[PDB]
């Protein structure tokens, strides 16, 4: 599996608690370790999984209540990352124009999403699109 270290910004993200992210404005930003994983590739959409750099936490999508939901999830570093990632971890990275979208494989049409307001959490469903800043 190929990984890069990178960040995201809105149309910044930070680790606001032990398994939570928040979006706000400016340099303690969360660095993700992005990995390309098996799945369905087509025009400008690549399967990806998002983990934290030097933390064994990966974004995943589950049903809480009976609504798909975004959570940071603990995983064994020996087993992760792997090429065949479990669907919950699988994000369909979509690029249109100059902007990216991440769509839960497990639940299509649900995306990584942030509030317009400052200091609100990142959620699965309102800004659905994002900027990536690739880093050393």
């Amino acid at each position, epitope marked *: 599996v190929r990984s890069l270290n990178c960040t995201l910004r809105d149309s910044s993200l930070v680790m*606001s*608690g*032990p*398994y*939570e992210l928040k979006a706000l404005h400016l340099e303690q930003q969360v660095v993700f370790s992005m990995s390309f994983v098996q799945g369905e590739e087509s025009n400008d959409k690549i399967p990806v999984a998002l983990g934290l750099k*030097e*933390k*064994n*936490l990966y974004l995943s999508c589950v049903l809480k209540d009976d609504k798909p939901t975004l*959570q*940071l*999830e*603990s*995983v*064994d*570093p*020996k087993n992760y990352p792997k090429k065949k990632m479990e669907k919950r971890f699988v994000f369909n990275k979509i690029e249109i124009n100059n902007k990216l979208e991440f769509e839960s494989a497990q639940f299509p049409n649900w995306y990584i999403s942030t509030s317009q307001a400052e200091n609100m959490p990142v959620f699965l469903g309102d800004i659905t699109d994002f900027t990536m800043q690739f880093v050393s």
Partner: antibody
Framework: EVQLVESGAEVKKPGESLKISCKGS????????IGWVRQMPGKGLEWMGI????????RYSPSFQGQVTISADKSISTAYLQWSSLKASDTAMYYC???????????WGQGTMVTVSS | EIVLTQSPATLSLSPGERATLSCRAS??????LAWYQQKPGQAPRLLIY???NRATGIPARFSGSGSGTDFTLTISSLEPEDFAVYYC?????????FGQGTKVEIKR
């Protein structure tokens, strides 16, 4: 079984240094946050601090910032809590516990009693 | 600053009676509220997470509910081993707090 095992009871004098330990097994120690909790005799639970063993990211409670240090050795799967100079008022039971994303402490150690007297 | 306050401090009830324990947050919070049980001589154990979800192994007589500021733990019919101390708990960002505890006591 999923487990956290703490070290044994300590009886120390004031002014002494002390380090206690909390060792996990049955799961990946590096993947889950670990908290330390204080309980004074006859009293409630008080959160002291938390550490992510993978990268030793450490956050403290404001009432315990600078009174203690929380550390971890991933090669031993062990988190620690330590004092430089104990007072009598540190006399308490200390627990370590694993904090999972569903937002609770789901597995607790058996506790370690610390008694500080001359 | 978020304080969780429990009531009552001592809840004296008969074995077999239903028990309702209250935990009130000083300000509105997500429903990610946990409840722990501490039997005398023992370590706490998790009973309820996210307000209303029983943890694995926890008998069915324990339930939780609530949202906003107002949270309850209900034990539907008390058994001898239920007589113990209970604590609620939450976390806002990098702050974790506990209620001060309610001791469930045997009324006679």
């Amino acid at each position: 079984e999923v487990q956290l095992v703490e070290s044994g009871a300590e009886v120390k004098k004031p002014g002494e240094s002390l380090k206690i330990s909390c060792k996990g097994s049955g799961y990946t120690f590096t993947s889950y946050w670990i908290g330390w909790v204080r309980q004074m005799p006859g009293k409630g639970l008080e959160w002291m601090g938390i550490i992510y063993p993978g990268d030793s990211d450490t956050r403290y409670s404001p009432s315990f910032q600078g009174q203690v240090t929380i550390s971890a050795d991933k090669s031993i799967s062990t988190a620690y809590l330590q004092w430089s100079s104990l007072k009598a008022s540190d006399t308490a039971m200390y627990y370590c516990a694993r904090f999972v994303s569903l937002d609770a402490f789901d597995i607790w150690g058996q506790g370690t009693m610390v008694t500080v007297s001359s | 600053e978020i304080v969780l306050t429990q009531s009552p401090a001592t809840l004296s009830l008969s074995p077999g009676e239903r028990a309702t324990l209250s935990c009130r947050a000083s300000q509105s919070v997500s429903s990610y509220l946990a409840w722990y049980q501490q039997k005398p001589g023992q370590a706490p154990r998790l009973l309820i997470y996210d307000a209303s979800n029983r943890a694995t192994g926890i008998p069915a007589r324990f339930s939780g509910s609530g949202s906003g500021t107002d949270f309850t733990l209900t034990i539907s019919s008390l058994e001898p081993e239920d007589f113990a101390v209970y604590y609620c708990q939450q976390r806002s960002n990098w702050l974790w707090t506990f209620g001060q505890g309610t001791k469930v006591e045997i009324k006679r």
